[PDB]
């Protein structure tokens with residue numbers, strides 16, 4: 016999930032938008 | 037400037053990006 | 058809603074807990 | 079102290095209340 | 100007190116240092 | 121730079137003033 | 142625990158602390 | 172923009188920054 | 202609520218959240 | 232992305248997230 | 262150093278930075 | 292005052308605290 020994509024790995028601001036409602 | 041604009045009105049991440057090195 | 062209530066008046070940690078997954 | 083209980087180990091919100099005045 | 104002064108007017112890091120242990 | 125002085129190593133508040141404009 | 146006055150990012154910080162690993166939904170009006 | 176490690180409080184702050192008014196979910200178990 | 206690791210700035214933010222008006226002490230040497 | 236209302240330290244946090252490793256300059260008026 | 266305008270959690274952050282390992286007491290009025 | 296490790300968001304928060312109105316640069320590649 017988000018922890019693996021953005022914390023464990025790295026992610027972009029655009030990727031973070033995946034988790035918006 | 038940007039600092040003042042973000043606080044008194046609003047600003048975008050795109051405007052913020054102009055202050056990166 | 059909760060977001061607005063916490064900012065315009067006050068809210069409790071107990072009310073916040075209702076937004077957990 | 080608090081660092082050992084809450085940082086090194088883990089602690090609850092209720093435990094943190096131990097450090098209130 | 101310090102908490103109120105920093106928020107309603109201004110305070111210095113030197114004044115803050117008086118609250119260290 | 122700053123990361124090596126303050127993150128990797130440790131630095132003082134006075135050292136941080138080196139990076140002020 | 143005490144009552145809270147939380148705007149902006151400070152509400153999200155409180156949610157994070159309260160929920161931890163359970164996660165949470167942040168749902169502002171409009 | 173850039174790619175960085177964002178974890179815990181810092182990850183939720185970043186979701187708040189990017190989503191704002193839209194809202195977001197933080198579901199670390201998923 | 203939950204149990205998490207809270208360290209440095211994040212630990213003091215959490216004490217602020219839970220204690221508020223009551224005040225608190227942060228005494229890491231003790 | 233959404234528009235932002237950012238005062239004080241919250242602007243610096245946003246700069247940090249937007250620029251990451253590139254860094255940034257923080258230049259308030261007077 | 263410059264003078265500071267600090268409310269809420271931002272005062273606790275400043276105390277943390279100023280005192281570090283010495284710790285500090287946070288003592289708001291009433 | 293004291294010497295501590297200050298990294299990422301926490302380092303920029305500290306530069307904000309110490310520099311304020313003066314402004315600052317965060318240039319981690321340099």
Ligand SMILES: [Cl-]
Pocket residue numbers: none
């Ligand atoms: Cl604020």
Ligand SMILES: [Cl-]
Pocket residue numbers: none
């Ligand atoms: Cl951290």
Ligand SMILES: [Zn+2]
Pocket residue numbers: 151241271
């Ligand atoms: Zn704030």
Ligand SMILES: [Zn+2]
Pocket residue numbers: 181211301
């Ligand atoms: Zn952190």
